[PDB]
Ligand binder design. Structure first.
Ligand SMILES: [Cu+2]
Ligand SMILES: [Cu+2]
Ligand SMILES: [Cu+2]
Ligand SMILES: [Cu+2]
Ligand SMILES: [Cu+2]
Ligand SMILES: [Cu+2]
Lengths: 439, 439
């Protein structure tokens, strides 16, 4: 096949993407070895769904797992009556998700399970796939003429031909695997044919962070989780926390081989040690550096000029409320809290009004990084750690290091009950989630 | 007695004001005629209670009326567990109100019934009295050397030696009386002995407005409902709506007699007419002018200089929520609404957080003036009708003419359930009231 492995794409046809997927244990070849993973559509990652605004999506999920499951349409501003975080599809049963893709939407989104208490092992085992919303902006020459690829960043650990089981320490830290893969491949080679690449990036890992850097090159950020920036932003590196997406332009500068790496990053994961009268928690420290892929530049690369503008960011109404959500940890118990409470599906934590804007100040009073995710209602990050964000774009996950406060501008869109939670999915399963009702 | 009648004063003693009042039908002489009014303490108005910050008040109210009653400590930022708008004292029974006067407080406040559905006839019949909180500011020379008086502005109508009964039109408009009295006296004479007067003003009427003007003189506003201004404000006239208080300095300019008048004012009260195929509501138009009192200046008056400053207004924390409360009318039904609902004592309408600040936008979409009152939590009026307020001071009633929006900064103080309502008390009795819970 193509030197660069990417998930198969399923496109809407005549404004309709109608598809039946099965969630199923699937024997496959992965990183040179045979394993049984849990997959959608028989593959890992699952198929990439590619749609346009105003398309109808009709996705029937058949559950062929031995446990209940469901889907979260991560990042899509649709109704929580469709993207329903409380729905359970029992083993052997099916459910049809039907929705219209919002008019004002573009970017890279994804789908994965969200059945509380069961997310981490299901996601770890291979249940996820991408969803791309094509825009009219894709037709501008500076993007149209770029070579486009999706990079699904997901790690894995195998034991006895199956995903490794979660240990108690995994529930505390979030589970990371030794196989650090791109599109289910181990360090693939991307032999570029054009001098400008457009890369859609997805961190679909349970807990691993990717401090992205391409050797000898900057990256040009053109989209965040949920939409385009207003103009490209040059960065020397780009941190993607679990659940985050980004799109970047890469402008290949000369011929040669360039490593795309996940540089060392310390997200505050913990180990245990015993030093003569101890048995206490110790920092694992930064991750070991990983090579994600080999990028081979073409001969005599002459990249396109960058687009001067992308999408103007909407002018939001003045906010009508400020919320404060404080994240804390009980590491030895592997329990995680928002405002001193663990998740309770019966309890409503925040009640807001549709079509108003809120300011949410989310504060991490723990020692680990926590990537905070809100369903249904994409937000604008104003600042984090007291530092203003250098761009305007829609996001739906925001990373907070220890001690940091993020200030978010949150327009409330669809009515109904939905959730917010840490996207280190083990932490969500272990209680770090709350309920927002919009009326 | 003194040419100028003022209610008897009861003062705290050794930091304690301990007093038993009875609410009782009382034969008395009023405006030259004999009548039976409902009174506290056997008088109309009831006695003026005079206290200092940190005093203890212990007031036992004995109900000798044929209906239940209670007290509202109008304007006092105390607990709604004491100033309890839901408490009922049955006929023949007693209740003791005990509270400490807040440290940071000064001004003219008052007490009257607040038993929903029964306020208007009880207040109209004569149940009210003043409460004055003395401050250290009263010792400044420019105030100490002024001649001080309380003016309780309250009208009355008599029928068969008793307060006139409410008609259906009274429930629609709020009841006004033909006897327009000051301290229960008909057009008293105030023979000033000093050139500077300090007048504490209270509108304790059900519904009558007083567009105050002293002939040939401006007034110097030094306090609003719930505290001092930051410095005196010169005004040519001063409108006091039902429930409002003000304190003014008057600087007598020359010898002579000067009328203090209630000038014509149209608050939007309605009548009915039939003109050949009608039977429909017609504006009553402005009130007829009234003389409130005769002010006689002393010989060769040389008033004191005005104080340069009074009390700095507190710097409030940034607000965390904005509320919108819309007032509407159904005049022919004599029903009045807040956000489309009438009062229900079981229903909580707003839930806020103690020690935070809120912005309340109160909008009058009716045609009558409505004076909006909030219990427990004094507010700063920022603007009304889109016009910035010309001073900073604590208020607890704000008048809105037809169409006007008031923007208020509302620090939430004591925890508990309390109410907000129109202080045209007929409108409150007829539903224009809601419930705020502070937690
Ligand atoms: Cu997700
Ligand atoms: Cu977390
Ligand atoms: Cu979620
Ligand atoms: Cu009152
Ligand atoms: Cu009213
Ligand atoms: Cu009241």
């Amino acid at each position: 096949g193509p030197s660069f492995p990417e998930p198969k794409v399923v496109r809407s046809q005549g404004g309709l993407l109608s598809l039946k997927l099965s969630a199923t244990p699937t024997p496959l070849a992965i990183a040179g070895q045979r394993a049984t993973l849990l997959t959608y559509g028989g593959s890992f990652p699952g198929p990439t769904l590619r749609v346009r605004p105003r398309d109808t999506v009709r996705l029937t999920l058949e559950n062929r797992l031995p446990e209940p499951t469901n889907l979260h349409w991560h990042g899509l501003p649709i109704s929580p009556k469709v993207d329903d975080p409380f729905l359970e599809i029992p083993p052997g049963e099916s459910w049809t998700y039907e929705f219209t893709v919002p008019k004002e939407l573009a970017g890279t989104f994804w789908y994965h399970p969200h059945l509380h208490g069961r997310v981490a092992p299901q996601l770890f085992a291979g249940l996820l796939g991408a969803l791309v919303v094509e825009s009219s902006l894709d037709a501008i020459p500076e993007l149209r003429e770029a070579e486009e690829h999706l990079l699904v960043l997901k790690d894995l650990a195998l034991q006895g031909g199956r995903p490794a089981p979660h240990t108690p320490m995994d529930w505390m830290n979030g589970k990371e695997g030794d196989l650090v893969l791109v599109n289910g491949a181990l360090r693939p080679t991307l032999v570029a044919q054009k001098a400008t690449l457009r890369l859609r990036l997805l961190n679909a890992s349970n807990a691993r962070y990717y401090r992205l850097a391409l050797q000898d090159h900057p990256l040009y950020l053109i989209a965040a989780d949920g939409g385009f920036l207003e103009e490209p932003l040059e960065v020397s590196e780009l941190l993607l926390a679990p659940g985050e997406r980004a799109e970047v332009l890469v402008r290949l500068r000369k011929e040669g081989r360039f490593l795309l790496q996940a540089l060392p990053y310390d997200r505050g994961a913990m180990g245990m040690m015993d030093m003569g009268g101890m048995a206490h928690a110790m920092p694992q420290g930064p991750s070991r550096p990983e090579t994600l892929l080999y990028l081979i530049a073409p001969k005599n690369p002459k990249p396109l000029p960058l687009p001067k503008a992308l999408s103007p960011f909407p002018t939001l109404p003045a906010p009508v409320v400020t919320r404060r959500l404080v994240l804390t940890e009980d590491m030895m118990a592997a329990r995680f809290f928002i405002n001193g409470q663990v998740f309770d599906h019966r309890r409503v934590d925040l009640k807001g009004q549709a079509q108003t804007v809120e300011v949410w100040e989310v504060e991490n009073q723990g020692d680990m990084d926590h990537p905070f995710h809100l369903h249904v209602h994409p937000f604008q990050v104003l600042s984090v750690g007291g530092r203003p964000f250098p761009y305007r774009a829609w996001k739906d996950v925001v990373n907070l290091k220890a001690g940091e406060v993020a200030r978010l501008l949150v327009p409330l869109r669809e009515k109904g009950r939905t959730v917010f939670h840490c996207h280190i999915v083990e932490h969500e399963d272990r209680g770090m989630m709350g309920v927002l009702e919009v009326g």
